[PDB]
Structures are given as C-alpha cells and as structure tokens.
Amino acid sequence: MGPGFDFAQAIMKKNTVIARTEKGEFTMLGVYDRVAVIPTHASVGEIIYINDVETRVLDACALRDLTDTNLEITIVKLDRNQKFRDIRHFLPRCEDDYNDAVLSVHTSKFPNMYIPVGQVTNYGFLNLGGTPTHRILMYNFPTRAGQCGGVVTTTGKVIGIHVGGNGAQGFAAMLLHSYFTD
C-alpha cells in the first residue's frame, strides 16, 4: 500500500519458502546461498519439506548468546539445487528499536499476508514458552498461531523473525549481520 509494504513484498517474492517440520508449517527466510532461518521451536531434523519437496538438511544450528541463553533462531543449510538472492546487506549490525515495521507471512493457511505492526521496541529478555530468551523485539499487535517465522522489515532493513505473542503483543528474534559471516 506504501513504501514499507513495497520493501516487504520484494523480500517475500524472492527470499521466502514454506518450510514444514513435524511441528508445523512456517514462513522461512532465505538469507544467502542455501542458508535460511526458522524459529528454533520448529525443531528442524535431518529432513525438512521446502515448498512440499523432501529436502536434506546439510547443517542446523540453534543460536545462543555468549551467556548460553536461547536466541530462538535456527540457521539451516538446505541441500537445495538453487541459491537465494544474497540479502545480508539488509541485516542490521546492532541491537536497536525501529519505527513503522511490517510483519509478512506466507503459508498454505496465510498466503500473501502483510501486517503493519507499528513501533518495534528492543525488549531484550523474554520468558518465551518457559524458555529464557534474549534479543527480543516487541510490537503491539495481536499476532496468532500460523505467523511464526514471519519476516519483520522496515524500509531498507530485515530486522527479525516472529517467534511468539501473548494475545496483545507479538515478539520477534533479532537478525544481525554477524550471524551470517562465512
């Protein structure tokens, strides 16, 4: 509808796949080469479905900070025959707050879904499904089941992936450039 939705649409059209695990269907952000991210609670195994195709997982790493606290981000390398457009130059380098973000979701259940969530706070610590979690972003939108893995963007930046909510607020794990140095 405006320039925030334009950046979000450009990310969804080239850098997302539908990932399915035993824990459900997720929006999955492709970042570069065959490397994507998904919420750690998706419980990625040796095999995953990518747009309904059986795909070998070459590597999966559940990130934790240097205090050994959950970050809720899993980095997956897919045995795929095609690379993602490299979008690492759109990743922030530091923890920050943001104005006017969009949460974008693409699953069987929620195709082509875009939500203007407004102001994003650097919330920091969250008890997420009973797990102490760091580097959480917060937005005041009543997010629901089916939206986990959703991409959070501003104009020019991919800042996080949706990992939970409390019925009134939604929570995303930060994406940082330093997660994806090769």
Dump the DSSP string for 29-78.
Answer: EEEEBTEEEEEGGG---SEEEETTEEEEEEEEEEEE-TTS-EEEEEEEEE
Structural domains in the chain (count): 2
d(CA 141, CA 60): 30
Amino acid letter for position 45: G
Catalytic residue, candidates 25, 134, 148, 162 = 148
Same domain, 3 and 27: no
Annotated catalytic residue 106: no
Same domain, 27 and 65: yes
Q: Domain range holding 64?
A: 16-84
d(CA 21, CA 119): 31
Last residue within a domain, chosen from 31, 50, 84? 84
Q: Which method, experimentally, gave rise to this model?
A: X-ray
Same domain, 54 and 128: no
Same domain, 3 and 65: no
Same domain, 69 and 112: no
- Which residues are CB-neighbours of 111 under 8 A, at least 6 positions away? none
Last residue within a domain, chosen from 42, 64, 84? 84
d(CA 85, CA 40): 23
Q: How big is the CA angle at 82 (ends 79 and 83), to the nearest 5 degrees?
A: 95
CB 102 within 8 A of CB 150: no
Catalytic residue, candidates 41, 106, 134, 162 = 41
Annotated catalytic residue 61: no
CB 12 within 8 A of CB 151: yes
Annotated catalytic residue 41: yes
Q: Torsion over CA of 182, 150, 109 and 117, rounded to 10 degrees?
A: -160
Residue 27 pairs with which residues in a beta bridge? Answer: 18
Q: Within 10 Å of residue 22's Cβ, how many Cβ atoms? A: 10
Catalytic residue, candidates 72, 106, 134, 162 = 72
